Design an enzyme around this catalytic site. Structure first.
Site, PDB file in Angstrom:
ATOM      1  N   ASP A 195      61.552  14.680  54.986  1.00 55.83           N
ATOM      2  CA  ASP A 195      60.845  15.909  54.674  1.00 55.83           C
ATOM      3  C   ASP A 195      59.445  15.898  55.286  1.00 55.83           C
ATOM      4  OD1 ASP A 195      61.723  18.036  52.327  1.00 55.83           O
ATOM      5  OD2 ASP A 195      59.561  18.011  52.850  1.00 55.83           O
ATOM      6  N   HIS A 204      55.545  19.463  49.931  1.00 52.08           N
ATOM      7  CA  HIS A 204      56.948  19.729  49.675  1.00 52.08           C
ATOM      8  C   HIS A 204      57.730  18.423  49.570  1.00 52.08           C
ATOM      9  CE1 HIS A 204      60.865  21.958  50.473  1.00 52.08           C
ATOM     10  NE2 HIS A 204      61.166  20.739  50.879  1.00 52.08           N
ATOM     11  N   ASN A 241      67.696  29.088  51.417  1.00 49.88           N
ATOM     12  CA  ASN A 241      67.150  30.060  50.475  1.00 49.88           C
ATOM     13  C   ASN A 241      67.283  31.493  50.995  1.00 49.88           C
ATOM     14  OD1 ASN A 241      66.137  27.915  48.611  1.00 49.88           O
ATOM     15  ND2 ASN A 241      64.691  27.473  50.269  1.00 49.88           N
ATOM     16  N   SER A 288      65.886  23.833  48.327  1.00 47.67           N
ATOM     17  CA  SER A 288      65.092  22.639  48.419  1.00 47.67           C
ATOM     18  C   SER A 288      64.850  21.968  47.056  1.00 47.67           C
ATOM     19  CB  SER A 288      63.778  22.815  49.248  1.00 47.67           C
ATOM     20  OG  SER A 288      64.146  22.852  50.614  1.00 47.67           O
TER      21      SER A 288
END
Length: 279
Positions: free
Chosen positions: A39, A69, A161, A224
């Site tokens: 990530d 994140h 998403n 996520s």
């Protein structure tokens, strides 16, 4: 073990019912397993990680998480308060820059990094990769994810998403890995959650409280954040000996809470990750 006033997502994954706030889990807690968080990096120094988190690889000028994140996902995998697998080892692979973006080739390189790097680590209970990332369909990103899976890593990837079918996104559309949708605390599909026949499971994805950079915390939403729940669950289940990397996604789907989610489009599985822990 019982964590009172846990985040709703942890409480959900140990519950046959929504609306509870205690997380129940075997104390082994993912000890002796490893989860790669591929990530934006991990703020390893965050007190929530207790020295169990480390950066192992970066493709940028820094290995630090300047975004938050990756730190947030790592916290849901294994931080002491917000994590599913509170004793696992966390390995940060920074394939995303601090704006959260990465070239697929850097992402592919990072996946191939994990598939070799796990031979440099002590993970006797097994290896998980959480990929809270994605973009458009790419057969080369799909195949990098399949190679990582094939090397003996449970791969868990976000469905995306876009509220669309996940077949048009990678690595979500790779069938061999574990594609994760997002649900909210009322057992609804998250309004943003992708769906489709390629999804394997749902996890908590709406308003997920976890670690953030600067030693803080915050609540954010996304397929996520559903992915580290499943990634943390896989590490937890592998430590308990209930499954292996090759069969964890499928074990999780077999043992999931079935038919409990609403607004799940016809053809998508109605399965919510569940640790099946009996206290």
């Amino acid at each position: 073990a019982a964590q009172t006033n846990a985040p709703w997502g942890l409480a959900r994954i140990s519950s046959t019912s929504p609306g509870t706030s205690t997380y129940y889990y075997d104390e082994s807690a993912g000890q002796g397993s490893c989860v790669y968080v591929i990530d934006t990096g991990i703020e390893a120094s965050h007190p929530e990680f207790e020295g169990r988190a480390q950066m192992v690889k970066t493709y940028y000028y820094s290995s630090r998480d300047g975004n938050g994140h990756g730190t947030h996902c790592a916290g849901t995998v294994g931080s002491r308060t917000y994590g599913v697998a509170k004793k696992t080892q966390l390995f940060g692979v920074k394939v995303l820059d601090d704006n959260g973006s990465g070239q697929y080739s850097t992402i592919i390189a990072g996946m191939d990094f994990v598939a070799s790097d796990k031979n440099n680590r002590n993970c006797p209970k097994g290896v998980v990769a959480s990929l809270s990332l994605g973009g458009g369909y790419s057969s080369s990103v799909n195949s990098a994810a399949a190679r990582l899976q094939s090397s003996g890593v449970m791969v868990a990837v976000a469905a995306g998403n876009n509220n669309a079918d996940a077949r048009n996104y990678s690595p979500a559309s790779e069938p061999s890995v574990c594609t994760v949708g997002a649900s909210d605390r009322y057992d609804r599909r998250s309004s943003f959650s992708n769906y489709g026949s390629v999804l394997d499971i749902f996890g908590p994805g709406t308003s997920i409280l976890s670690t953030w950079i600067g030693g803080s915390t915050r609540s954010i939403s996304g397929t996520s954040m559903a992915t580290p729940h499943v990634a943390g669950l896989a590490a937890y289940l592998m430590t308990l000996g209930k499954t292996t990397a090759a069969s964890a996604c499928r074990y999780i789907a077999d043992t999931a809470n079935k038919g409990d989610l609403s607004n799940i489009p016809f053809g998508t599985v109605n399965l919510l990750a569940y640790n099946n822990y009996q206290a």
